[PDB]
Swiss-Prot record, chains A, C, D:
Its EC number is 3.4.-.-. Belongs to the encapsulin family. Family 1 subfamily. Homomultimeric. This encapsulin nanocompartment is formed by 60 subunits; monomers form 12 pentamers which assemble to form shells. There are 12 pores where the pentamers meet as well as 3-fold axis channels and dimer channels; none are larger than 3-4 Angstroms in diameter. The N-terminus of the protein is inside the shell, the C-terminus is outside. Probably 3, 4 or 5 Flp cargo decamers bind inside the encapulin nanocompartment. A flavin ligand is bound near the 3-fold axis channel; FMN is consistent with the observed density, absorbance data and mass spectrometry. Has 3 domains; a discontinuous peripheral domain (P, 13-39, 76-133, 221-254), an elongated loop (E, 53-73) and the discontinuous axial domain (A, 137-216 and 259-263). The E-loop forms contacts between two subunits, while the A domain mediates contacts in the 5-fold interface. Pores are formed by residues 184-189, pore size can be modified by mutagenesis. This is Type 1 encapsulin shell protein. FMN binds at R79, A80, T81, W87, D90, N91, L92, E93, R94, E235.
From Swiss-Prot, chains B, E, F:
Probably forms a decamer which binds to the pentameric axis of the interior of the protein shell; as the Flp cargo protein is flexible, packing into the shell is not rigid. 3, 4 or 5 cargo decamers bind inside the encapulin nanocompartment. This is Ferritin-like protein. The 15 or 30 C-terminal residues can be used to target foreign proteins to the nanocompartment. It is found in: Encapsulin nanocompartment. Belongs to the ferritin-like superfamily. The lineage of its organism: Bacteria, Thermotogati, Thermotogota, Thermotogae, Thermotogales. The chain holds residues 106 to 113 of 114 of the full protein. The C-terminal 15-30 residues (cargo loading-peptide, CLP, or targeting peptide) are sufficient to target this protein to the nanocompartment in vivo, while the C-terminal 5 residues suffice in vitro. It comes from Thermotoga maritima (strain ATCC 43589 / DSM 3109 / JCM 10099 / NBRC 100826 / MSB8).
Length: 264, 8, 264, 264, 8, 8
């Protein structure tokens, strides 16, 4: 992609792809959002808003040519700059296996946190209603192993009456899961009992929510809409360092909320 | 070129 | 196009295309906007906004993941309903050459008026700056034939210094032109002297503006952006009449204002 | 061309050629000089002077090996730098149709003004005698339409006796022409009467001279001698802007002055 | 079908 | 490459 003016950064082949791979590794396990919603293939660097498919009436019956606006859903562009030490990446070429690019590791994670935030609670400013804002899809849950199983099956039953069925997934706070794993200490693995009561579903632990969440990955209920996917580009050179960045273009919508169940 | 290419 | 639920209207072949042709005839000569701006082929009934290609910064330097929104330019949907007498269109089949569809003629013109309004002054509500709002491109003009010629040639010279050159066109109030044709009564045709001082350009008389306007139709300076082009559909049946309508989906932007010159 | 170090500017394909096209559009209508003199195809970035073809005697008859220097006519290099906002041309890629490059528009025009100056009055410093400095080829002209026609035909007659004949052209002050077009207001087009009395010649209005000028474009009388033609290159990057420039290499000579007639 | 088809 | 290419 030509605009990330990467060709102009003072970096070798090895260097560029060493930076890329590091960020790819982190994004893969830290974009908790994408682990269970679906992504809508990159629409292009210039895609500006995703159509919502409604009109905004703006006329009296006093006017003959009645009319309105088409509701769209503008995409966020984000740009997280960071600096890397040149005379250090140079070291990659000298042989050095691990080069010090913690400057990048953090920036990546912060971008990751950003996106999840939008998937999970949304920017009111951008018009996207987050996952957790769907109050009508909240049910109460205990704190025993047994209380969780109960929740699951009651959930599977709310789905059953909406027709909603995919493979089912448990999104769950990392620490909360450590806690359920306390009382279920070697009688029989909680992992498998949850996966069973989910009918062959999977379980995603995450530090992006504080409670729990249940969805069906049957697909097409949680669109993350990509314009230009997460890329790395070059901004400038600060004497003895390089300023790269991390751009993305996106938005999000919960289409069929009935594929969603929130917890306590 | 560029990009990064993640999407699950 | 399936959505204008035309197949469900109680109308014959002859009938439908008789309605269509009538409206086509009027729109062709009454869409004064399109006579000189260019159109960007139908982007589709669901196109919701045309990208403007800018960001809207929305973050402090306090945030690490800086970000904003992508400026787009939402399209207007319009819908002008009207009624036609059934037991009269039936008459088309009995043989009647001219069927009474003045109900439609007016509706068409009103939709026409609408679009021109947006091309010429815009809806502030929709985000489109009309043609006449470009104050910086206004120059003073007299009222003699000689004063007009003068205006033209001075205009052609402002273009010349911006590099702007196509064929040149004179948009002009219908009555104002009748008045310039008063003093230039058979010495030598004003038509040809204006067309000459425009360098082989053309002249469009119109009741959509009160003064005058000069543009180059070199193209790509005045985008009328179509989503679903002007179509006719069917809404419902009111006992002994039919309610059809006229939909469109569009927006407009003046790209290179330097191809534009306003008058007195 | 390798030296304009364009490959080193942080600019995309779209970006570079969008800059180029803007400059090309303006140069085309603002290099009034070239509209009627001929150009001698690019001699090369290193061409240093165009031979004049004379000797400069520099020896007494006291010396046996008599000798002199060869009169040449050194070329001007010009270099007009200007700045463009990077994070704004970046916007071209986001979709933006018109990108704000007025910084360039002006710089172009100033380079244009420069060249015309040398064609019309010359730099004494560089050794080039301008067009208007040829006093012997000046004749008096009135201010009526009739007085102009008169001038023309008398001019065509001074040519006729020097054997000078091409198509004939009228170079003329822009405002002066508006003034002759005052009294000739719709009896019969001045345009065509001048073009007729010029025997099918053309008329160039221009804000580069204050009076008028008549030449024959038969060719080879007014050499603009190009070394490296008008090009755009890259100088440097100022934090958040780019400094490009406009170079040219040229000189000028009026070969056969009898193809030239100056006015009042 | 539908549409109308004007565009100059 | 470079250049600009005007000449009448």
């Amino acid at each position: 992609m030509e605009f990330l003016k990467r060709s102009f950064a003072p970096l070798t082949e090895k260097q560029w792809q060493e930076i890329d791979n590091r960020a790819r590794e982190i994004f893969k396990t830290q974009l908790y959002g994408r682990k269970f919603v679906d992504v809508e293939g990159p629409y292009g660097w210039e895609y500006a808003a995703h159509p919502l498919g409604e009109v905004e009436v703006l006329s009296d019956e006093n006017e003959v040519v009645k009319w309105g606006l088409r509701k769209s859903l503008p995409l966020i562009e984000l740009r997280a700059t960071f600096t890397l030490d040149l005379w250090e990446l140079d070291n990659l070429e000298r042989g050095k296996p691990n080069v010090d690019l913690s400057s990048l590791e953090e920036t990546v994670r912060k971008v990751a946190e950003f996106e999840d935030e939008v998937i999970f609670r949304g920017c009111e400013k951008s018009g996207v209603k987050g996952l957790l804002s769907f109050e009508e899809r909240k049910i109460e849950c205990g704190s025993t192993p047994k209380d969780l199983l109960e929740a699951i099956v009651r959930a599977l039953s709310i789905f059953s009456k909406d027709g909603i069925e995919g493979p089912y997934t448990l999104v769950i706070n990392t620490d909360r899961w450590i806690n359920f794993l306390k009382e279920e200490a070697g009688h029989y693995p909680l992992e498998k009992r949850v996966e069973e009561c989910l009918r062959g579903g999977k379980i995603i632990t995450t530090p992006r929510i504080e409670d729990a969440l249940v969805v069906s990955e049957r697909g097409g209920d949680f669109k993350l809409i990509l314009g230009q996917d997460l890329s790395i580009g070059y901004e400038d050179r600060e004497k003895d360092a390089v300023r790269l960045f991390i751009t993305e273009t996106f938005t999000f919508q919960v289409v069929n909320p009935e594929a969603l169940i929130l917890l306590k | 070129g560029g990009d990064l290419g993640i999407r699950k």
